[PDB]
Symmetry: C3
Subunit: 240 residues, 3 copies
């Protein structure tokens, strides 16, 4: 296995987008590309990462890795790369290696791996009654702001975000028009932990838009396109 990613900035932001939510994950390296699946230690949320082999320059993959990366350690290592370095990931077939370029400085770190083995669930495309596409910056400020009002945001479509706390309560209305796009089939209303929404927004540097997909029968989806390569999907169950 070896994958050379010009524009390692992506790999950097990916790790930044994961490390606050989960401490380790099985990286499932494959011929189709890098795909990751993991839940936070409370099992309220699931993140799925997809970097497809076409978005990497080079890319090669003899066998199927079930790499157990310590996501803390990987993010630490990944902070030693400048935003412009060319990151490469080589892993033979129990420790992963990483390489940063430029072209005058060049750095080789090598990360001890870990024995994580849980298989991946098969997660298919559900049907959502309300689907919202909006600027990701806007969405991050809404979760940041409301989280100084209360612990939980109520999301509604007819789209409105509401939080209720000790000092009072607030709500932000957003209307269809970066653009804001609402796709309803049915009115929908669910409450979520702002704690985890504020983890999810750490992916904001990966895309200017975000997409929210709500239904009463499935977890919320919060997804960031890693353009020309894949996506970061966050799944979040509601509160009861």
């Amino acid at each position: 296995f070896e994958a050379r990613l010009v524009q390692g900035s992506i790999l950097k932001k990916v790790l930044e987008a994961l490390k606050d939510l989960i401490n380790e994950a099985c990286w499932d390296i494959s011929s189709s590309g890098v795909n990751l699946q993991s839940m936070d230690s409370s099992h309220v949320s699931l993140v799925q990462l997809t970097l497809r082999s076409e978005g990497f320059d080079t890319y090669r993959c003899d066998r199927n890795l079930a790499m157990g990366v310590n996501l803390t350690s990987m993010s630490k290592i990944l902070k030693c790369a400048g935003n412009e370095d060319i990151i490469t990931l080589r892993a033979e077939d129990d420790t992963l290696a990483l390489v940063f370029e430029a072209q005058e400085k060049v750095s080789d770190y090598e990360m001890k791996l870990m024995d994580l083995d849980v298989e991946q669930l098969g997660i298919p495309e559900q049907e959502y009654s309300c689907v919202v596409k909006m600027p990701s910056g806007e969405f991050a400020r809404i979760c940041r702001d409301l989280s100084h009002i209360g612990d939980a945001v109520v999301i509604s479509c007819a789209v409105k975000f509401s939080a209720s706390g000790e000092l009072g309560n607030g709500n932000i209305k957003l209307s269809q028009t970066e653009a804001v796009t609402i796709e309803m089939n049915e009115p929908v209303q669910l409450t979520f932990a702002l704690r985890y929404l504020n983890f999810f927004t750490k992916a904001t540097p990966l895309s200017s838009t975000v997409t929210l997909s709500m239904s009463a029968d499935v977890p919320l989806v919060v997804e960031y396109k890693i353009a020309d390569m894949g996506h970061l999907k966050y799944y979040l169950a509601p509160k009861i």
Copy 2:
């Protein structure tokens, strides 16, 4: 119904930031002439007095007169959910206060519970000051911050000199009459102030480029920031 609309709502942002590290609560006197606040810090050595005239709002409504008990900690948290460009509107009926932030298709409505904090305002007349100094606000801020790294107290004197003395050594800053610097000085005067409260005061620096210091051995010092077109923030502090 009271309802005030302020297009330049960052003023409100700045006013709460100028109050919150000094006082936790306050009675906002709402009348048809505008908003008037006066409140003292928990240790009774300083008084701050805010004036926002109705004509200085873009829109003013005040059917009945109000005395709003406000948790300034709560109100400041709310007001940080507003962007610096948001148009802010305050509204209340004849028990809670409503705030509205207008971005142009995002619109936020927060609701704050009031409290029973009613204390009739004192009449504070104009006094006569042995020395009166008009300086750039930022310089006043820098001086107080500098000297507080030297000692706990500042000695101010005119003929203007700011002096501090501590375990480290001593220091003093001389400003000369000429933003401009202006010393109406009908009298030499030298007094001593707690830099802790001055440094609270300078949190109103954003509200104006200039600050006016009025001193006299017979009356509290007055630190005054004009809120252009709308009123002032006046901080009164007792010496020794």
Copy 3:
């Protein structure tokens, strides 16, 4: 009486900012030739040497030779009250006087207590080194910062390579000859150094865009930042 006036007073700001975290005190050697400082950290594993020549000052008056014992923690704290554009004057008849001149709008006078600290400087002669690396200061700071999250110690070797090993894994950074990188290698050396002191040394990075590492196996590591027109800051550090 001693009186050195520096129009680029920011040089004093950066110099003190570069010493404060390594040493808390030092004897300053004031003579007609200028300012000479030689101090060791309390662990006695590193030595810092400061040269500021008289011709590098705007005025330099030395009526009598001095050995000022200075509390470097006090003098840093005072120098933070200087603005980076200020003219800074040090003066000593006991006590040390610092004058900050803003031109001139504000004029600041600070006074510091001296202390009894007088060791005699020692003759460090121009040693001969096996490898001399001149590079961007900022890059050297980044390498040391980066590697210090991997391990406690960096292994430097002469191309030139920085290595560090720890609980996470391992890392190598290689800079080839090419601000420029020039490696003047006389025989390959390989010494291990505590990253904790190298990160102290790099606090001087604002004084020069270029740093110079010099290594032999028989002598301490030398890390030199020139102070344009005045002299240098030499950090010296023993291996393991």
